[PDB]
Amino acid sequence: GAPDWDRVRLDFPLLMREVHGKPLVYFDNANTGQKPVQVIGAVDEFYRRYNANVVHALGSEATDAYEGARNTLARFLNVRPSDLVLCSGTTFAINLVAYSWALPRLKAGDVILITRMEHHANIVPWQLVAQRTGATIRVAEITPDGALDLDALRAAMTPEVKLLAVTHVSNVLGTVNPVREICREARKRGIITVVDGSQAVPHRKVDVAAIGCDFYAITGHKMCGPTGTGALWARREHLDAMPPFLGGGEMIKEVSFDGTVFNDAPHKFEAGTPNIAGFIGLGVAADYLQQLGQENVEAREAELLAHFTEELRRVDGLRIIGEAPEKAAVVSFLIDGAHAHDLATLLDLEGVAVRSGQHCAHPLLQYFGVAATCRASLAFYNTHAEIERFMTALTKVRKLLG
Amino acid sequence: APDWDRVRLDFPLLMREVHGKPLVYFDNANTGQKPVQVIGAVDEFYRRYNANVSRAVHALGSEATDAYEGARNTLARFLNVRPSDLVLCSGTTFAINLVAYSWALPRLKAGDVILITRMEHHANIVPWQLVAQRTGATIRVAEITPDGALDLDALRAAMTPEVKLLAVTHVSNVLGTVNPVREICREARKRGIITVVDGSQAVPHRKVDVAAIGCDFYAITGHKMCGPTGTGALWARREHLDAMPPFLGGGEMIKEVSFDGTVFNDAPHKFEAGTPNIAGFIGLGVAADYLQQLGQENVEAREAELLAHFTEELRRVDGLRIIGEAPEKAAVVSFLIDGAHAHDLATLLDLEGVAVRSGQHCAHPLLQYFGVAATCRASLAFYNTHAEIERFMTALTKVRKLL
């Protein structure tokens, strides 16, 4: 559609913030994303006009909105709404698979294969259930450019491997993994795939069904949506076969002390009152991104990334962690003789929000041999002028640490 | 004493119309309405300092972290507990399931008994049915008497040495009954019986000093105490939080992650995996401060007046039966009328602008004891008025005579 990006930016009122007496440059979109006023106003209007559980008039509109949001998010991912479980975030989504798929199935001798670049959300659940089942964890290695080693991956997918946890897009490296080809091969070998989509769906069109995976998790607050929102897509055969996770109201059909009958998926896995307001907003957020066009977002952020990377390469002593041939607008970097945390601290005082640390990916940073990276992560509402301002601030900050 | 007319003006939704008639929202037990301080708190977060929390670097992240942990401290004072022992989660339902998965699942074995009261909400039943399904524990029911009160004689008789856990509600969402949780938990602790207390209908309607109850675990939910959806909390004795294994795994609840071995944070973050509902909990903190500012005792007194007025006028209705007439009660009234289907009462009352709920109210076993397929439930909040009560009874008379 080719939207006007200077108009699009005006939808985001937080970008008018000033911090430390300076206009904010928000380059921490990988930590959480900012919301268009359409999303903020949808939540506000729910609380002011039709707050009710999901009956009477307000309860009726609240329910249509809540399920309407599931339909919208499902069209956003190109999956069926009945296969889409709504939850508080990617972390909940993956733990649901860990407790309800793997925990009742794995045994001694089974192997869980996890790539070196996984976020802790796609590592720690598997460690918990591996320890409980007697299963063992094997690491799928990466190369120094931040790519997944596909040859090593193929060789690691031996018959004893029962599940592969793999990120769609790395939150540290920006790397875009070929999840379609990965999941096609894992299925050929009887290996279940759990794909972490948290950093994919904000930055590119994702057709989840076409990936051919078994489970796919997203988190709402990184895709223009309210906090406490997220979803798990899963093959229907899996949602039918898995036991319930959380128990309570709404996931039951009939409750008796003699025995309870459970609902079918997806409500089967949604216990208790949902985050009604948050998912109403995520519906609006998913619709907002589709109206922009996800492919336009991807092209816009690739233009921002190329500008930022071209300028960042002129910095003496700088190196980028994550130089894969396809990546989202996430740049982790280090500067010789400068501590990443000093860089983040001084950049903040110049109005620029970045993140220094390990980004909840400790094994990945261990492979690179570094205690932290400074990460600037960009979104379509950032501007080329902000990038030029960032380079001016970095030069001033680096001179302050000289 | 608070000016209750001025308090009601804090709630902007109550101004709206339904079918061209004024809205009379008597479905507060389903979810509560929000004061403008809470609504604007959530709106201000997204507009002015939306960022992630913990290990804060930049200005907005610091502001977001201070607000979020500030909300935990405000809720803790609301409950008179330490914030270090208060786990924030998406509602009562999650709070109880955390107990089920991380306390009971690793501990109970075949032969052990989980004791659950007849009046519990599904939130305090189904998790224990999952535990029995995977441990071989058996579930035993603590009965009620026809006035909706918990039969304490039968409860003591039911608390035998094989019972290891008791699921007991503080306030029933159907009956309104207020249970003597302090007495119950003292007697449970004397027999080595863990108590999980469902406070979802307690903390919005009365002052609860959670620590003085003497229970092992206490669960609340945010959207019924003036707060955002997707919020709630689990309080627990410190000894349990330390001994319990983690439930959800991910960021924030770890301290160090390696493929050779991971080290977890301490409570409460031990049990809060991944990015929190930052906006929701910032708003829940304002809700807690709003209720502490009014005075929880002042709210309890207000809704008792509303209850007494509503009950006195309701009992004038011919053929009307109130299910739940325990001695001490919150402002929740479930009722039936001879010749009137509960669902038909709700459908037509809504056409008069009155919002109530008819059905089983996620308490199927309680309804089985009474032998009724449904009830009509009016549930009052402090921002309701005596005038609305009178408007309600006129709509009830209009609707009763329409069928």
Side-chain angles (χ1 to χ4, degrees), chain A residues 1-54 56-180 182-402, chain B residues 1-76 78-108 110-182 184-342 344-367 369-397 399-400:
Chain A
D4 178 3
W5 296 111
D6 288 313
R7 177 47 188 95
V8 175
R9 177 175 166 104
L10 298 177
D11 288 340
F12 290 80
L14 183 121
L15 304 181
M16 307 191 288
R17 246 321 271 277
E18 302 197 344
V19 295
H20 305 293
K22 294 168 175 304
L24 166 79
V25 184
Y26 187 78
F27 280 8
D28 202 18
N29 299 285
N31 212 7
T32 189
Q34 301 308 338
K35 332 292 175 194
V37 65
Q38 294 87 337
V39 167
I40 307 177
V43 165
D44 185 81
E45 174 176 2
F46 174 74
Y47 287 132
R48 283 173 197 273
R49 195 180 54 66
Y50 61 106
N51 175 73
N53 209 331
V54 301
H56 45 62
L58 275 68
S60 196
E61 187 175 11
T63 304
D64 286 326
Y66 177 61
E67 290 295 334
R70 185 202 310 275
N71 293 2
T72 304
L73 190 66
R75 296 189 292 265
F76 175 79
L77 305 173
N78 196 45
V79 303
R80 292 192 208 267
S82 42
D83 297 339
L84 192 60
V85 172
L86 301 180
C87 51
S88 65
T90 283
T91 305
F92 186 103
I94 290 170
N95 283 275
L96 192 153
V97 181
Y99 278 82
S100 297
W101 175 270
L103 178 65
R105 289 170 202 252
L106 299 191
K107 68 201 164 170
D110 298 339
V111 171
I112 306 175
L113 187 58
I114 308 173
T115 89
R116 164 80 49 187
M117 67 169 77
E118 295 313 294
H119 185 284
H120 293 168
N122 214 14
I123 298 173
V124 179
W126 310 119
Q127 301 183 295
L128 288 167
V129 296
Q131 211 224 32
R132 288 182 58 186
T133 55
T136 57
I137 288 178
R138 177 177 305 156
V139 186
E141 288 306 332
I142 61 155
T143 39
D145 61 339
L148 201 45
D149 184 342
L150 294 178
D151 291 331
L153 176 63
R154 278 184 283 277
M157 294 189 296
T158 57
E160 70 263 37
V161 177
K162 301 311 182 200
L163 189 144
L164 164 69
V166 51
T167 192
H168 196 168
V169 172
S170 167
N171 71 308
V172 176
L173 304 173
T175 300
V176 181
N177 290 329
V179 283
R180 201 195 76 255
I182 291 164
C183 297
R184 173 176 58 245
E185 181 68 18
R187 182 163 313 278
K188 190 179 194 294
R189 306 179 176 204
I191 300 171
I192 295 293
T193 48
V194 179
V195 173
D196 187 342
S198 312
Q199 301 280 344
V201 295
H203 304 303
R204 53 195 288 118
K205 197 148 187 305
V206 184
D207 174 354
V208 161
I211 293 178
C213 61
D214 298 281
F215 299 94
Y216 192 96
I218 61 165
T219 198
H221 69 102
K222 290 176 180 184
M223 50 164 285
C224 299
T227 52
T229 70
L232 173 84
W233 174 87
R235 294 179 59 85
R236 185 234 178 114
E237 51 164 349
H238 298 333
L239 298 169
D240 288 359
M242 286 189 297
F245 185 33
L246 271 45
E250 305 297 294
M251 52 84 69
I252 55 97
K253 182 180 311 162
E254 311 294 350
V255 170
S256 167
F257 284 118
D258 293 324
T260 284
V261 181
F262 298 98
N263 278 333
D264 286 315
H267 297 111
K268 174 181 182 178
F269 295 103
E270 303 167 352
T273 305
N275 178 10
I276 301 170
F279 280 99
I280 288 173
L282 186 58
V284 178
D287 172 78
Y288 182 92
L289 289 173
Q290 299 186 86
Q291 290 193 32
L292 281 189
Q294 304 92 304
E295 64 296 325
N296 294 325
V297 163
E298 177 188 359
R300 167 71 173 184
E301 299 183 345
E303 191 184 88
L304 290 175
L305 168 69
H307 181 190
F308 183 97
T309 300
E310 176 162 53
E311 292 311 298
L312 210 77
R313 284 309 198 180
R314 307 175 62 113
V315 172
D316 284 1
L318 183 140
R319 65 188 187 94
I320 296 173
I321 305 287
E323 313 156 286
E326 186 169 354
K327 59 183 286 192
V330 176
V331 184
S332 293
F333 64 97
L334 295 181
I335 306 174
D336 246 289
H339 291 276
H341 281 99
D342 295 337
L343 289 178
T345 293
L346 294 180
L347 281 169
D348 176 56
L349 296 181
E350 302 295 323
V352 183
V354 292
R355 177 154 199 74
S356 280
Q358 303 177 88
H359 312 295
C360 290
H362 297 187
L364 172 56
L365 269 82
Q366 161 192 272
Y367 168 87
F368 274 98
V370 301
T373 70
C374 189
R375 183 190 70 190
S377 52
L378 312 189
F380 59 87
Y381 41 77
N382 292 123
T383 67
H384 287 298
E386 282 175 336
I387 293 174
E388 287 297 322
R389 187 185 156 190
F390 178 99
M391 304 298 157
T392 296
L394 179 53
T395 296
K396 167 187 188 177
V397 156
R398 205 206 167 176
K399 288 191 186 303
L400 287 171
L401 302 161
Chain B
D3 176 9
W4 289 112
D5 295 300
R6 170 72 187 80
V7 175
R8 166 179 180 96
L9 301 182
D10 280 334
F11 295 80
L13 179 147
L14 307 178
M15 195 169 295
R16 68 160 290 176
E17 309 195 88
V18 175
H19 301 107
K21 294 165 167 290
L23 170 64
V24 177
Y25 186 80
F26 282 2
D27 199 24
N28 295 288
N30 213 345
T31 194
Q33 300 305 330
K34 322 303 178 187
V36 79
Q37 295 82 351
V38 168
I39 290 171
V42 169
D43 186 84
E44 185 201 39
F45 172 75
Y46 291 126
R47 283 177 188 274
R48 295 278 302 167
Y49 59 109
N50 175 70
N52 216 318
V53 295
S54 192
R55 247 214 330 202
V57 178
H58 48 74
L60 297 193
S62 170
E63 301 186 8
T65 300
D66 295 353
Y68 172 72
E69 290 299 337
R72 186 204 308 275
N73 301 342
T74 300
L75 194 52
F78 184 69
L79 312 165
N80 197 39
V81 305
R82 300 188 54 165
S84 209
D85 306 337
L86 192 63
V87 180
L88 306 175
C89 56
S90 61
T92 280
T93 303
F94 189 106
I96 293 179
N97 276 273
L98 171 48
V99 184
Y101 273 85
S102 286
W103 175 268
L105 220 43
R107 290 169 187 258
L108 302 189
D112 298 330
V113 172
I114 303 171
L115 187 62
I116 311 176
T117 94
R118 173 63 61 172
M119 73 174 59
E120 293 312 298
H121 180 276
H122 292 166
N124 215 12
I125 297 172
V126 185
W128 313 113
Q129 288 178 317
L130 298 176
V131 163
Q133 183 73 81
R134 306 173 189 164
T135 65
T138 76
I139 290 185
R140 178 186 299 166
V141 181
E143 285 316 333
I144 64 154
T145 53
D147 65 336
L150 191 68
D151 186 350
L152 302 184
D153 273 353
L155 175 63
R156 277 182 282 277
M159 290 188 300
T160 53
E162 56 268 10
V163 183
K164 307 300 180 192
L165 191 143
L166 168 66
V168 51
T169 188
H170 192 171
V171 179
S172 159
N173 68 305
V174 171
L175 308 162
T177 296
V178 177
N179 285 331
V181 292
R182 190 194 233 255
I184 288 152
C185 291
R186 173 196 60 244
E187 185 61 41
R189 190 165 311 281
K190 207 163 91 167
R191 318 191 183 212
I193 296 174
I194 295 303
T195 50
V196 182
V197 176
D198 182 350
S200 314
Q201 298 289 342
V203 301
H205 302 284
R206 67 199 290 105
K207 184 163 187 305
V208 185
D209 178 347
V210 172
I213 299 186
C215 58
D216 299 284
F217 299 94
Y218 193 98
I220 61 169
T221 197
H223 68 99
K224 286 167 184 188
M225 53 165 279
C226 292
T229 60
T231 60
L234 175 72
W235 175 87
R237 305 173 53 92
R238 183 74 194 177
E239 65 172 329
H240 299 332
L241 291 167
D242 291 342
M244 283 163 58
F247 183 28
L248 271 49
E252 306 317 299
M253 55 81 71
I254 54 88
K255 185 176 308 185
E256 303 286 344
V257 171
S258 152
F259 286 120
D260 292 334
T262 291
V263 180
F264 303 103
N265 265 334
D266 290 332
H269 293 99
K270 180 181 177 179
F271 299 105
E272 297 157 2
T275 301
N277 183 8
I278 303 171
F281 277 100
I282 288 178
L284 182 59
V286 178
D289 180 67
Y290 186 92
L291 291 173
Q292 282 183 101
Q293 286 298 112
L294 296 198
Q296 306 102 306
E297 286 99 337
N298 290 322
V299 162
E300 167 180 9
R302 163 72 165 180
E303 296 175 351
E305 183 183 355
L306 295 166
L307 170 63
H309 177 194
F310 180 95
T311 297
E312 188 179 16
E313 308 296 310
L314 206 70
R315 288 193 177 282
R316 308 185 195 278
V317 170
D318 186 51
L320 184 136
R321 154 156 168 60
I322 292 168
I323 289 161
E325 338 114 5
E328 183 175 29
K329 201 181 129 124
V332 174
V333 176
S334 292
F335 65 94
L336 284 183
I337 302 171
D338 265 330
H341 282 356
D344 289 312
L345 291 182
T347 305
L348 299 173
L349 281 175
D350 172 73
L351 294 178
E352 305 293 294
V354 177
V356 302
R357 178 58 162 157
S358 297
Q360 309 197 72
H361 312 290
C362 285
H364 295 183
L366 175 60
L367 269 74
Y369 164 83
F370 281 103
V372 305
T375 67
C376 195
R377 186 190 62 183
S379 36
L380 306 175
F382 58 85
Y383 47 74
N384 293 122
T385 69
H386 292 292
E388 281 175 340
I389 290 168
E390 294 294 337
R391 297 189 50 81
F392 173 98
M393 308 285 168
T394 286
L396 181 56
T397 302
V399 161
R400 208 250 188 282

